[PDB]
Design an enzyme around this catalytic site. Structure first.
Site, PDB file in Angstrom:
ATOM      1  N   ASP A   1      45.390  45.200  48.977  1.00  0.00           N
ATOM      2  CA  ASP A   1      46.174  43.959  48.614  1.00  0.00           C
ATOM      3  C   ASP A   1      47.319  44.083  47.496  1.00  0.00           C
ATOM      4  O   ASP A   1      47.426  43.278  46.541  1.00  0.00           O
ATOM      5  CB  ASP A   1      45.163  42.830  48.292  1.00  0.00           C
ATOM      6  CG  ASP A   1      45.838  41.473  47.881  1.00  0.00           C
ATOM      7  OD1 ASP A   1      47.105  41.377  47.721  1.00  0.00           O
ATOM      8  OD2 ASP A   1      45.073  40.484  47.702  1.00  0.00           O
TER       9      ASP A   1
ATOM     10  N   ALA B   1      37.171  32.274  35.361  1.00  0.00           N
ATOM     11  CA  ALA B   1      37.644  33.300  34.402  1.00  0.00           C
ATOM     12  C   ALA B   1      38.816  32.876  33.486  1.00  0.00           C
ATOM     13  O   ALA B   1      39.742  32.081  33.861  1.00  0.00           O
ATOM     14  CB  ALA B   1      38.008  34.619  35.122  1.00  0.00           C
ATOM     15  N   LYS B   2      38.771  33.412  32.274  1.00  0.00           N
ATOM     16  CA  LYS B   2      39.885  33.260  31.356  1.00  0.00           C
ATOM     17  C   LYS B   2      40.254  34.681  30.916  1.00  0.00           C
ATOM     18  O   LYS B   2      39.471  35.621  31.107  1.00  0.00           O
ATOM     19  CB  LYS B   2      39.540  32.282  30.201  1.00  0.00           C
ATOM     20  CG  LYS B   2      37.997  32.120  29.896  1.00  0.00           C
ATOM     21  CD  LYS B   2      37.643  31.106  28.766  1.00  0.00           C
ATOM     22  CE  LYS B   2      37.997  29.656  29.199  1.00  0.00           C
ATOM     23  NZ  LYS B   2      37.844  28.546  28.169  1.00  0.00           N
ATOM     24  N   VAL B   3      41.469  34.863  30.417  1.00  0.00           N
ATOM     25  CA  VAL B   3      41.893  36.166  29.887  1.00  0.00           C
ATOM     26  C   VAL B   3      42.483  36.020  28.494  1.00  0.00           C
ATOM     27  O   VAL B   3      43.476  35.271  28.308  1.00  0.00           O
ATOM     28  CB  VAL B   3      42.911  36.851  30.779  1.00  0.00           C
ATOM     29  CG1 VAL B   3      43.137  38.258  30.288  1.00  0.00           C
ATOM     30  CG2 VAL B   3      42.391  36.884  32.166  1.00  0.00           C
TER      31      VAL B   3
ATOM     32  N   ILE C   1      45.695  34.195  27.451  1.00  0.00           N
ATOM     33  CA  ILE C   1      46.898  34.501  28.250  1.00  0.00           C
ATOM     34  C   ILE C   1      46.724  34.353  29.791  1.00  0.00           C
ATOM     35  O   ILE C   1      47.546  34.874  30.563  1.00  0.00           O
ATOM     36  CB  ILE C   1      47.519  35.874  27.851  1.00  0.00           C
ATOM     37  CG1 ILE C   1      46.454  36.957  27.686  1.00  0.00           C
ATOM     38  CG2 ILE C   1      48.307  35.720  26.568  1.00  0.00           C
ATOM     39  CD1 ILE C   1      46.911  38.303  28.141  1.00  0.00           C
TER      40      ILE C   1
ATOM     41  N   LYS D   1      44.110  31.484  32.624  1.00  0.00           N
ATOM     42  CA  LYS D   1      42.937  30.567  32.717  1.00  0.00           C
ATOM     43  C   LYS D   1      42.241  30.423  34.116  1.00  0.00           C
ATOM     44  O   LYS D   1      42.645  31.078  35.108  1.00  0.00           O
ATOM     45  CB  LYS D   1      43.294  29.162  32.103  1.00  0.00           C
ATOM     46  N   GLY D   2      41.163  29.619  34.143  1.00  0.00           N
ATOM     47  CA  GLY D   2      40.656  28.877  35.336  1.00  0.00           C
ATOM     48  C   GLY D   2      40.575  29.544  36.697  1.00  0.00           C
ATOM     49  O   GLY D   2      39.489  29.929  37.128  1.00  0.00           O
TER      50      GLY D   2
END
Lengths: 293, 296
Positions: free
Chosen positions: A123, A13-15, A9, A11-12
Site C-alpha cells: 500500500d 490512536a494519537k501521535v 501531532i 489524532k483519532g
C-alpha cells in the site's frame, strides 16, 4: 514512561512528539488503544510491529522502543519533522527531474530493501512518504496507486504490486499529478486497466522510459527493483555511483562508548547485550539506540 | 458581490467553489456553484455537461433542485437548492447510529430518490454519504467512495446497471443503522477480499427485519438483485407505514401558469410571454430561476 510527551501531532490512536529523557532526543510516540481495535485490525497491528522491528534503512522510519500494556500499545520511533511529500508537491508544484530523482532514489532503495526481506508494503501512498529535517525520504488516497490485478480479481501478493505503485509515485513526483484519474471508481478502473497515461510536454524521454519500466499491466512482466535500479534515468548525475540494493550495516552491540554510559545509568552489560541480541526493543535497547546520535 | 441576480454571501466549499447566495428579486437562499471550465480537462468536461443534463430533468423533493444555469465561455454557474443541515456522514459521527425508526425515515426518502432516477434510466453510479445531504428539516437531499463499490468493479465485470446503485444502497442502510461500514479494511486488497466474500457483521441490536432487508440489497450476483420497486415493498421499509406503502414517486405535472407568481414577475418587469417561453423552454435562465424560487 521514560519520555516527556510534548505536543500532539496526529489524532483519532494519537501521535505525540516527545523527548527521550535520558538522552534529550526527539521521538514520535504512537499511542494505540488496543481495546478499541477489532479482531482483524489487531492482527494488522501486530504484523506491522514485527516488520518495524526488522527494518533498518536510512529512509524508512526507525523503530526505537515498544512498550506493551494490556490496553495500550506504545510505539516509539524516528520523528519525520518534514511533513509528507504529498504536501510538498501541493506546496511547490512538480519536482524538477533532478530533484524527483534525488528523492526517488531513496524511495526505491527503501522499498527494495523491504523486498530483500520478503516484505511487501502492499500500500504505497504519498500520504506515506515523509521527509525529515533535511528533505530525506522517510517511509511509514490509496486507490490511484492500486495495481491492475486488484480490479481484475487477480491475486494481490507480490512485490510486483509495490513496483507498479512506485510507477505512480514517480509520475506524480515529476508531473505534480496522478497518472490515472477519475471522478469515481468505474472511471479510475477503466483508466488504470488501459494503462495509458498522459505524457507532459516537459518530460524527458529518459523519464518516460523509466515510467514504462514500472507501469506494466502484466504483473509478472515487471522488473525487480534491482533491475530498475540499473535504469539510466535513475542514475543520471550518478555516473560514478550507480544505485545498488542497500546493504545492511553489521550489528554493533558493543560500542564501548555507549555501553559505558549505560553502565553509568545502572544498566548491566549483561542486559544491554541481551536486549540487543534479543532485539527486544525494551528501554535498554531504546536507550542504546538513542545514544546512537 | 454580483452575478445574474444573486448577492453572493459566504463560501461554503473550495478548490470549483460553492457560494451561499441570495437571489435578489426573491430574497431566497441558493447555493451557487462556480466552475472554471478552462481548468477542466477534456474528460471532466464531458462529465460536467452530462451532470448538467441530468439536473435539468430531476424533480424530486429529496434530490437538490436545479434553479439556474448561467454559461460563460470560461465559467459555468449552477444555481441550486441549499441544503443547510450538512451531510448525513457528519450526522452519524455526530449522533451515533440511527435507531431503526429514524434510519427508516431517511432511508425511505433515499430509496425513493434513487428509484426516481432509475425511472429515468439514470444511474447515480457513485452513492457515497458524503453524497446525502439534509435540509433544515432533516430531509434527505441528494447531490470515501470505495467502501460503496459493488463487487463487479473488483471483478472486471461491466459496471453499468441500476444494480450498482442497489448494492450501494445496501451499504448505506448498514451504516445508517450501525454507524459504520459493513465492509472495511486497512487497504484495498482487504476491502476487496471483504467485499467479494459479501459476509458482513451483524450487530446484536439489529432487527431480523432489518437484516432481511439488507440481504435484499447486498447480493453478490448483480443480476440477482431486486429492483428498488421490489425493495420498496419490503416489510422493514414499511413498518410504521401500515397504511401508506412506499411506491415509486410520481412527479407532479408542470404549472407554468401560476397566476400568483406570474403576477409578481410582471411586477418585476418580466413579460408573461417570456415567463411562458422560458418554462416551456426549460431554459433555466434568470426568468425561470425566479419563477422557481418564487415557489417557496
Amino acid at each position: 514512561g521514560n519520555y516527556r510527551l510534548l505536543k500532539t501531532i496526529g489524532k483519532g490512536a494519537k501521535v505525540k512528539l516527545a523527548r527521550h529523557i535520558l538522552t534529550g532526543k526527539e521521538v514520535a510516540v504512537r499511542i494505540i488503544d488496543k481495546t478499541q481495535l477489532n479482531s482483524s485490525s489487531l492482527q494488522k497491528l501486530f504484523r506491522e510491529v514485527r516488520i518495524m522491528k526488522v527494518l533498518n534503512h536510512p529512509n524508512i522510519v526507525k523503530l526505537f522502543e515498544v512498550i506493551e500494556t494490556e490496553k495500550t500499545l506504545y510505539l516509539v520511533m524516528e520523528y519525520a519533522s518534514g511533513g509528507e511529500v504529498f504536501d510538498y508537491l501541493v506546496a511547490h508544484g512538480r519536482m524538477k527531474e533532478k530533484e524527483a530523482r534525488a528523492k526517488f532514489r531513496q524511495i526505491v532503495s527503501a522499498v527494495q530493501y523491504c523486498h530483500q526481506k520478503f516484505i511487501v508494503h502492499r500500500d504505497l501512498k504519498a500520504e506515506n512518504l515523509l521527509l525529515d529535517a533535511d528533505m530525506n525520504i522517510k517511509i511509514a488516497g490509496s486507490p490511484p496507486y492500486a495495481a491492475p490485478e486488484l480490479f481484475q480479481g487477480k491475486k494481490y501478493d507480490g512485490p510486483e504490486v509495490d513496483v507498479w505503485s512506485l510507477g505512480v509515485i514517480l509520475y506524480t513526483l515529476v508531473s505534480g499529478s496522478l497518472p490515472f484519474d477519475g471522478q469515481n471508481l468505474k472511471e479510475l478502473r477503466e483508466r488504470v486497466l488501459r494503462g495509458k497515461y498522459r505524457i507532459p510536454f516537459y518530460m524527458s524521454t529518459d523519464c518516460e522510459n523509466l515510467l514504462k519500466k514500472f507501469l506494466i499491466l502484466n504483473p509478472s512482466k515487471r522488473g525487480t527493483l534491482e533491475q530498475i535500479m540499473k535504469d539510466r534515468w535513475m542514475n543520471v548525475g550518478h555516473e560514478d555511483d550507480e544505485l545498488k540494493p542497500y546493504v545492511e550495516p553489521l550489528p554493533d552491540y558493543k560500542d564501548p562508548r555507549r555501553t559505558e554510559l549505560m553502565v553509568s545509568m545502572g544498566y548491566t552489560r549483561e542486559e544491554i547485550q541481551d536486549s540487543l541480541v534479543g532485539q527486544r526493543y525494551n528501554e535498554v535497547m531504546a536507550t542504546y539506540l538513542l545514544l546512537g546520535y
